[PDB]
Design a binder for this molecule. Structure first.
Ligand code: 6TX
Lengths: 353, 19
């Protein structure tokens, strides 16, 4: 066989230990999911420093905690805008997930609170910026570099899927790099708890699995498709399916055809053909052997999964970091003051926040 | 080249979700 006795026993034992870790992690998540924390700080505890990113809901600001001096990333959501944008459920869901999960590559919600106008989620500040920026700058990552990041996503999805969470929002724009060079996942508005199927059209065109495009009921395998797209983009510098307009992207996605740069290793192409598999009965991560088909693939043969989880692997790239509060890895944005109305807006909608 | 096609697509910047 492919493994002698020692290697097979070691792998079996490792896979059983994963099961044991995940069963405990589910116990812990379900406790926090049923009894969420709330109202653990307030706005005048923080000085606002700089906008790190903006979206249709509001924005994320670098803030400094006045007493501790600690920097954080504060997501500010305009309640009236959230309601107009039809995002009440997503917003409440994101906060509920963030307060309940616990994994080294998932951003930690340190405080949350609300006032008459806005919702606030105060997260650890991840100073390295988006993977997207580094990928476009460097061009493409080497296969060892791409693999170091990919392994973290595999483990994070293994974790999330054990909690019946489908992630659905994977792309380099949504992965931050921390001071040690490891990945942080921050966005959970599109994540959903579901043990079976779900049907919402959501995601980013380049990263959509065919069964989403085709308006099918779908499951957590769409995350493994998205991992395939991410690994391809990290290693190529561009995604596997692109075009001028989304409709053309979708035609390519559903076609069952993918082409690879000549510099891709055969091991990499083999993994990507099994992740970017239009046929759900054949897609890695969706088979009887589950995530083990991915973790045990030749392209990951040099990956020490436990060492990645323990953050004991030396990162291939450490972002520049001039000190706490350094924002140089983030873009510059127009700074709009934040107002709280004298009149509470949208109170009932957000009582759970 | 494929890279040139990627540049030509106009989708080299940050990509929005369907939302
Ligand atoms: C409206 C974009 C917000 N961003 C997410 C990009 N998908 S973000 O500003 O990058 C950001 C979000 C959440 C936590 C963060 C922690 N540390 C630094 C930035 C952080």
């Amino acid at each position: 066989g492919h493994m002698g006795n020692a290697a097979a026993a070691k792998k079996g034992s490792e896979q059983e230990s994963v099961k044991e870790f995940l069963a405990k992690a589910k116990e812990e998540f379900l406790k926090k999911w049923e009894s969420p924390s709330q109202n653990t700080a307030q706005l005048d505890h923080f000085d606002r420093i700089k906008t790190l990113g903006t979206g249709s809901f509001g924005r994320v600001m670098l803030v400094k905690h006045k007493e501790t001096g600690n920097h954080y990333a504060m997501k500010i959501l305009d309640k009236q805008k959230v309601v107009k944008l039809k995002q009440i459920e997503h917003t409440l869901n994101e906060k509920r997930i963030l307060q309940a999960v616990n994994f080294p590559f998932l951003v930690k919600l340190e405080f949350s609170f609300k006032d008459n106008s806005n919702l606030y989620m105060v997260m650890e500040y991840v100073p390295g910026g988006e993977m997207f920026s580094h990928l476009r700058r460097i061009g493409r990552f080497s296969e060892p570099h791409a693999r170091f990041y990919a392994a973290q996503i595999v483990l994070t999805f293994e974790y999330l899927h054990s909690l019946d969470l489908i992630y659905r929002d994977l792309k380099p724009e949504n992965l931050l790099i921390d001071q040690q060079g490891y990945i942080q996942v921050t966005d959970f508005g599109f994540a959903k708890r579901v043990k079976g199927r779900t049907w919402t059209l959501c995601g980013t065109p380049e990263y959509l699995a065919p069964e989403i495009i085709l308006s099918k009921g779908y499951n957590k395998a769409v995350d493994w498709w998205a991992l395939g797209v991410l690994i391809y983009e990290m290693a190529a510098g561009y995604p596997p399916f692109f075009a001028d307009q989304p409709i053309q992207i979708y035609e390519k996605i559903v076609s069952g055809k993918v082409r690879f740069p000549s510099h891709f290793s055969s091991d990499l192409k083999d993994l990507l053909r099994n992740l970017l598999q239009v046929d759900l009965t054949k897609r890695f991560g969706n088979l009887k052997n589950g995530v083990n088909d991915i973790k045990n693939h030749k392209w990951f043969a040099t990956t020490d999964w436990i060492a990645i989880y323990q953050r004991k692997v030396e990162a291939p790239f450490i972002p520049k970091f001039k000190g706490p509060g350094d924002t140089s890895n983030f873009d510059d944005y127009e700074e709009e003051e934040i107002r709280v109305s004298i009149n509470e807006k949208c109170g009932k909608e957000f009582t759970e926040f | 080249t494929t890279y040139a096609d990627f540049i030509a697509s106009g989708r080299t910047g940050r990509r929005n979700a369907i939302h």
